[PDB]
Amino acid sequence: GQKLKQDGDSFRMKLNTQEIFDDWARKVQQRNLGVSGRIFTIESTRVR
Amino acid sequence: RKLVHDKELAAEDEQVFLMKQQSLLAKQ
């Protein structure tokens, strides 16, 4: 029983989830997504 | 005095309008 419980606890620790949430939030902050600016943009492209 | 149709509707090719609006967006 204790062997089973420690196997389950170790698997659950390996099964943690908040780290990915923190990483995604950090990436969102680093990239700093936004929409503020012009209504639409006109740009330059040399279409083949 | 038979009147003739005046200047017709122009095309104003999209490229010219687009570049003019590039300029306007640049200076705004």
Which residues of chain B are within 8 Å of residue A42 when distances are taken between CB atoms? 18, 21-22, 25
The 10 Å CB-count burial string (b at 16+, else e) for A10-48 is eeeeeeeeeeeeeeeeeeeeeeeeeeeeeeeeeeeeeee
The experimental resolution of this structure, in angstroms, equals: 4.5
Question: Who's near A41: CB < 8 A, 6+ residues apart?
Answer: B25
- Measuring CA to CA, which residue among B17, B2, B6, B3 is closest to residue A42? B17
Query: What is the least distance, in Å, from the CA of A36 to any CA of chain B?
Result: 15
The tokens for B7 are: 């200047």
- Residue with tokens 């698997």, as numbered in its chain: A11
Please name the method used to determine this structure: cryo-EM
**Measured between CA atoms, how close is B22 to chain A, in angstroms?**
6
